[PDB]
Design a protein around this ligand. Structure first.
Ligand SMILES: [Ca+2]
Ligand SMILES: [Ca+2]
Length: 184
């Protein structure tokens, strides 16, 4: 499951009629009531801040990467309520074990490159711990922490975790396996 097939679903398969009609009304109130024109709403995008009106996805230490990666735009200066809302609803329940990992591995990779480094792992665990504190932070102790986990989990000790290794390593030991419950 590559980012390709996913892009195909994002096209015009994740956009229903009832959800779009109802969602449009909700996003309409936030926007000038005078511009209630549909030909303008569907032909026009929604400001960035306008989206921030949902502290929900904000709780995500990387709401910028999740939206940018999940959303699509030319200069990435605008955000559509379609993809944005789709991400929420999709990650609300549709979040199936399969799409769960795929989405994760993608969001987990802070570099958004594909592979995962010791830092990426120190970001998800830290950020969640309590961003802005001496708590679980990158250091000598945290250095041997990831290494030890990689050795106990993966053998190739490639020094990094890929998609295949991510799905396993994560669900290979009560470690992140138990915490793998819900992440975003
Ligand atoms: Ca990386
Ligand atoms: Ca490995």
């Amino acid at each position: 499951l590559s980012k390709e097939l996913l892009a195909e679903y994002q096209d015009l398969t994740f956009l229903t009629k009832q959800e779009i009609l109802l969602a449009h009304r909700r996003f309409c109130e936030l926007l000038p009531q005078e511009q209630r024109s549909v030909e303008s709403s569907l032909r026009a995008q929604v400001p960035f801040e306008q989206i921030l009106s949902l502290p929900e996805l904000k709780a995500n230490p990387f709401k910028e990467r999740i939206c940018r990666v999940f959303s699509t735009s030319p200069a990435k200066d605008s955000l559509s309520f379609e993809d944005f809302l789709d991400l929420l609803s999709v990650f609300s329940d549709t979040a199936t074990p399969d799409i769960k990992s795929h989405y994760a591995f993608r969001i987990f990779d802070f570099d958004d490159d594909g592979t995962l480094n010791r830092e990426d792992l120190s970001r998800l665990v830290n950020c969640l711990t309590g961003e802005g504190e001496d708590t679980r932070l990158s250091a000598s102790e945290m250095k041997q922490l990831i290494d030890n986990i990689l050795e106990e989990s993966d053998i190739d000790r490639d020094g990094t975790i890929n998609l295949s290794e991510f799905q396993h390593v994560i669900s290979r030991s009560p470690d992140f396996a138990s915490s793998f419950k819900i992440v975003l």
